[PDB]
């Protein structure tokens, strides 16, 4: 049964990473993620240690003293010139040694099962953990909010364009007024249509100037709400600057909405990270379950051999196969480093 420890350790590490770099503000999810990352790191360390620790326990069984001794007992029992008292004594020695070997194998199975059981309990601590209920709905809510924020932003850009166009018209009027120094001719109030129309330059020049000045004045009065008859230059300049400040108000609003979009997108990223955490957890848990099943089958077969007696060679093949397997896993672990 081939197992990929590389994927297991890489999933553990990615889980830790994503927990470290998760940006979603939910306190519950943050706490749960921290807990699961700690459980996974504890499990990685405990697995490394369990592999390094288990091989000696099984190794002790193969080099059991009682086996060569049993052989020597049988050798002695091969002698015909022996008393039935001594024969039964040696027979009891052999049978007792078989009983001690079985007892020792059971003690080994208990120790091995305990070591594996601690890992199993940690795997259970990991699996039982639930990050959040129906996360996909949370992601849906977050993306819906992001869409709503963008849809509320777009009209702000359109309105900024309209006010900027109005500012352009107003400042055109101001700069052209100074260009022709009209302020000096009509210093008290803006010249009416007839007043400017009566004198100077060309009818195209006159008409262009009139349209520009009237456009500026109309926009200014509309912004300030006063009627056209006010005809004051100061009203024009005041409206210009006041509309510009309103544009700055729009900039403030837009910056706030952009910051909220930043938070929402950051959150969505965090949630995606949590989903990837769950996926990597699944990846890890699959390999862990495979190793657990391997070890349980091994323990069952070893219990079967304990129930049966002697049969040293097949037992050695079993234990050595398991040791080679453990060494394979340890080698796989060491390779990644």
Residue numbers in the entry: 14 to 350
Manuscript excerpt for this entry:
α-Xenorhabdolysin is a PFT that has been first isolated from the bacterium Xenorhabdus nematophila. Xenorhabdolysins are also found in other entomopathogenic bacteria, such as Photorhabdus luminescens, and human pathogenic bacteria, such as Yersinia enterocolitica and Proteus mirabilis. They are composed of two subunits, namely XaxA (45 kDa) and XaxB (40 kDa) and are only active when the two components act together. Xenorhabdolysins, which were suggested to be binary toxins, perforate the membranes of erythrocytes, insect granulocytes and phagocytes and induce apoptosis. In contrast to previous predictions, XaxAB is therefore not a typical binary toxin, but rather a bi-component α-PFT.
XaxB also crystallized in orthorhombic space group P212121 with a unit cell dimension of 89 × 99 × 194 Å and four molecules per AU. The diffraction data of XaxB was processed with the XDS package and SeMet atoms were determined using the CRANK2 pipeline in the CCP4 software package. The four XaxB molecules in the asymmetric unit differ considerably in their tail domain. Especially, helices αB and αC that protrude slightly from the five-helix-bundle take different positions. Although this might be due to tight crystal packing, it also indicates a certain degree of flexibility of the tail domain of XaxB. In contrast to XaxA the head domain of XaxB contains in addition to the central coiled-coil a helix-loop-helix motif, dividing helix αE and a 21-residue long amphipathic helix (αF). The highly conserved hydrophobic face of helix αF is oriented toward helices αD and αG and thereby shielded from the solvent. The conformation of the head domain is stabilized by conserved hydrophobic as well as electrostatic interactions, including putative salt bridges. Interestingly, in the case of XaxB the tongue is formed by an amphipathic helix, while XaxA does not contain such motif. We identified two hinge regions that facilitate the swinging out movement of αF in XaxB.
